[PDB]
Each structure stands twice: as structure tokens, then as C-alpha cells.
Design a protein around this ligand. Structure first.
Ligand code: HEM
Ligand code: UMT
Ligand code: CL
Ligand code: CL
Ligand code: CL
Ligand code: CL
Ligand code: CL
Ligand code: CL
Length: 395
């Protein structure tokens, strides 16, 4: 009979990869698909072709925002913000931004440990079941990013509550996204004017804003950096830690190994990154030339989607890809943080947030287990991350 063009995304479930990804990678590692907008796109699912796309800048991030392009989903930010990191570099701020978002600031890791332990103590006081997303992973991400930005902890929750809309993956524009964006930009602009904000990313930007070497950088860009790095960081670390906790909980042996030998936690977190399904969609790129990718000549103006778990579960690159193995010879060679020009600038911070969160959880809750059958988790739909709405656990 007549069937329709394969639709993406395949599944919003973040606890398991569909058997179909490996079939696709074997048969057609670059394949035409239809996005939620009705646009056509090329879905790339092997490690070799994913790397190729990500390392060829003729597959452009910023051109995805062009009027009239085939879209994966609607913009939730102004179109110039799709080029955020390019704009930051053009302003001469890349080195300073990247320095402020490392985990190296004195006291930062101790703050993370302290926060995690306090969050966990409060759950233990309250009694099982506990929700490890809403009452551990996300608050820990939110607290971390207020500290990194230099802004009050008490301002965290409001900025955070924009994110269930900001990171939607929608066929159509979202009126609430503009409402929240304008509000959060105004908040950050106020932060730059606030004399009490002297530390973290916003303290440093606020100084640079008054330094004559940056007098022609726009105020809008300074506020944009705060909103976008808070939102990207919080959504990415909170969502990654949440689904890494599921993967750990599902593996009691690994849980007990990391609990007994916490010096292995970094290698375990690197494998959890490798197998992580937090990104709900392929990474989008627009071709700016005709480019051969595998068996397909991608044409100028076409949309390409780089499926991270396609690369990261590719057995040609990671043998026994579904197994967490702490002694792989190529352990950071995954694509969890992307690759190339747009490699995640928060990568070290994201690693440390997950390592510290996991270390603290295994110490406080060595008997942690799901308090519901895994199929009872509710997976968020039409979102840029795969997130269970609640993560009920007992210990
Ligand atoms: C485990 C945590 C994280 C994961 C898995 C993650 C993942 C990624 C990925 C895959 C990309 C590449 C997107 C692409 O090429 O289209 C990216 C880029 C980006 N990430 Fe992260 N991220 C994480 C944490 C962070 C943090 C903590 C921040 C900031 C505080 C951050 C800020 C950004 C920004 C601003 C970009 C865009 C870079 C560019 O366009 O050059 N991420 N992230
Ligand atoms: C309302 C509307 C949008 C937001 C955001 C940002 C959402 C978003 C979407 C897509 N890309 C990106 N980034 C591109 C790369 O640089 C990092 C940021 N950021 C935070 N809070 C909001 C409130
Ligand atoms: Cl399946
Ligand atoms: Cl345009
Ligand atoms: Cl919602
Ligand atoms: Cl200049
Ligand atoms: Cl070529
Ligand atoms: Cl390979």
C-alpha cells in the first residue's frame, strides 16, 4: 500500500533507544524524513556521517534561521540568536564567556556539593517517594547556573519556569515564548545595571560593558548572553542528569560499583553521556552548497539533522554500544556535546554537574530505586529534550 515519508522524531522516550535507529543506520545512514513542520530533511545516523556534517561548516547552523528555509521546528528566540556564539565571538567576548562557565571558579564545586547534599537531605527528611527531576536534578542545575552567572539564587525559579516553553520543539511560533523572552531579557538588562552583581558571568560582562574596549557592543547582546546561557545550561544539565540517573538506577551493579569506587564516577559519567538520549531531535544544519554525504548529494538549501544517538550507538565506533563500559579506548569521542565549530562551550561544567550530583546521590541514597514501573514515567513531548515529567524514586 501507500505509506508516508518517515516522520521525526521517532520516540520521545528517553530511557531506551528504538530498535529502529540501528536498522536505519545499517540500511540508510542518511535518509529523507519529514519534520513536524511538514518540511523534508536528511536524517544522518552513523558516526562517520554525523562527524562529517558537524565538521563541515558549509552545513550551517545560522542559516537554519533564514526566512523560507525548511524548518525542524519554529524559532523560540529572535533569528539573530540562532547565531548566538558567532555574535559573542564577533563582540570579542568568547574567551571571557567560556572562562566564566568552567567549573574552575574557586568555591564552585563546593557549592555544587553543598547544594546537592542539602537537596538530598530535604528529600530524605520528607520521606519516599521523591521526585529526582523536579526536586533534585533541575533545582541543582538552577542553583548551579545562578552561581555561575553571579545572580541571586532567589531569581532562579522564575527564569527556570520559562524553560518548559523556551525549549519547545513546535511546528508553529509560540506566543508565550516571546512573552517570557522579553521579560527575561529585561531582567538580565537590570542585572547589568545592578551594582551588587560583581561575580560570575554577569559580573564579568557588567565590567566589560563599561570598559572602553567594548563600548560598541550592544546592551542587547550582553543581556542575551545571560538569558541564553542560563537557559541552555539549565535545560541541558538538568535533563542530562535526570536521564543519567534513570540509566544508573536501571543498573544496580554499576550503581554499586560507582558507590564503592567513586573515583570511577568520571568514567561512568562519560559513558552516561555517550548513551544519553536527552536531545529529542537531530541537530539541525542548512546546506549552503551541494555536498556529498554518503550515498546522497545534499543540495543547497536543504535541511540536515544530525542524530546524536545515531552516532553514539554506532557499533562501528563503540562496540557493544548499549553497554556501559568504563575501559573503552575512545571514551570522550562521543558526540554528546556535538563536534566542530559549535562544540558545547559548557561541556566541562556539564560533566562536573553530573559527576557531583551522582556522587552525592550514591552517598546519600545508596539504595535508590524507581518507585514506579519504568513504563509509568511520562515523557515530555514536542520538546527539544527528552524529559520524564516526574522521576519518582525510593531508597
Ligand atoms: C550535560 C550537559 C550538556 C549537554 C549534553 C550539552 C549539549 C550540547 C550540544 C550537543 C551542543 C551542540 C549543538 C549544535 O551543534 O547544534 C551544545 C551547544 C551549546 N551548549 Fe551545551 N550542553 C550541555 C551543557 C551546557 C551548559 C552547562 C551550557 C552553558 C552554561 C551550554 C551551552 C551551550 C551553548 C551556548 C551552545 C551553542 C554553541 C554554539 O552554537 O557554538 N551547554 N550543547
Ligand atoms: C523565552 C524564550 C527563549 C528562551 C531561552 C533560550 C532558548 C533557546 C532556544 C534555542 N537556542 C538557544 N540557544 C542557542 C545557542 O546559544 C544558547 C541558546 N536558546 C532561554 N529562556 C528563554 C525564554
Ligand atoms: Cl522499538
Ligand atoms: Cl532571513
Ligand atoms: Cl508545556
Ligand atoms: Cl572593535
Ligand atoms: Cl564536497
Ligand atoms: Cl565509525
Amino acid at each position: 500500500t501507500a505509506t508516508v515519508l518517515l516522520e521525526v522524531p521517532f520516540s520521545a522516550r528517553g530511557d531506551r533507544i528504538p530498535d529502529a535507529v540501528a536498522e536505519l543506520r545499517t540500511r540508510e545512514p542518511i535518509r529523507k524524513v519529514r519534520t513536524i513542520t511538514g518540511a523534508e530533511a536528511w536524517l544522518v545516523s552513523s558516526y562517520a556521517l554525523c562527524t562529517q556534517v558537524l565538521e563541515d561548516r558549509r552545513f550551517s547552523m545560522k542559516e537554519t534561521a533564514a526566512a523560507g528555509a525548511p524548518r525542524l521546528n519554529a524559532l523560540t528566540v529572535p533569528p539573530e540568536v540562532v547565531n548566538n556564539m558567532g555574535n559573542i565571538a564577533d563582540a570579542g567576548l568568547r574567551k571571557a564567556v567560556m572562562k566564566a562557565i568552567t567549573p574552575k571558579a574557586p568555591g564552585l564545586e563546593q557549592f555544587l556539593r553543598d547544594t546537592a547534599n542539602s537537596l538530598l537531605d530535604n528529600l530524605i527528611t520528607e520521606g519516599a517517594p521523591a521526585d529526582l527531576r523536579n526536586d533534585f536534578a533541575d533545582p541543582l542545575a538552577t542553583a548551579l547556573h545562578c552561581k555561575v552567572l553571579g545572580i541571586p539564587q532567589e531569581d532562579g525559579p522564575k527564569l527556570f519556569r520559562s524553560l518548559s516553553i523556551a525549549f519547545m520543539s513546535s511546528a508553529d511560533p509560540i506566543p508565550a515564548a516571546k512573552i517570557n523572552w522579553d521579560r527575561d531579557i529585561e531582567y538580565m538588562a537590570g542585572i547589568l545595571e545592578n551594582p551588587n552583581i560583581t561575580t560570575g558571568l554577569m559580573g564579568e560582562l557588567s565590567r566589560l560593558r563599561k570598559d572602553p574596549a567594548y563600548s560598541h557592543v550592544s546592551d542587547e547582546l550582553f543581556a542575551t548572553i545571560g538569558v541564553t546561557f542560563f537557559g541552555a545550561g539549565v535545560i541541558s544539565t538538568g535533563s542530562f542528569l535526570t536521564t543519567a540517573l534513570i540509566s544508573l538506577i536501571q543498573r544496580p551493579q554499576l550503581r554499586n560499583l560507582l558507590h564503592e569506587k567513586p573515583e570511577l564516577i568520571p568514567a561512568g559519567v562519560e559513558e552516561l553521556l555517550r548513551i544519553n538520549l536527552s536531545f529529542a531531535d537531530g541537530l539541525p544544519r542548512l546546506a549552503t552548497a551541494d555536498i556529498q554525504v554518503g550515498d546522497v548529494l545534499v543540495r543547497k538549501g536543504e535541511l540536515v539533522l544530525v542524530l546524536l544517538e545515531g552516532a553514539n550507538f554506532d557499533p562501528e565506533h563503540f562496540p557493544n554500544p548499549g553497554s556501559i563500559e568504563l575501559d573503552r579506548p575512545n571514551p570522550t569521542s562521543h558526540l554528546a556535546f556535538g563536534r566542530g565549530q559549535h562544540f558545547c562551550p559548557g561541556s566541562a561544567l556539564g560533566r562536573r554537574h553530573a559527576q557531583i550530583g551522582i556522587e552525592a546521590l550514591l552517598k546519600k541514597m545508596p539504595g535508590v530505586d524507581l518507585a514506579v514501573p519504568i513504563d509509568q514515567l511520562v515523557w515530555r513531548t514536542r520538546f527539544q529534550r527528552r524529559i520524564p515529567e516526574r522521576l519518582p524514586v525510593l531508597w
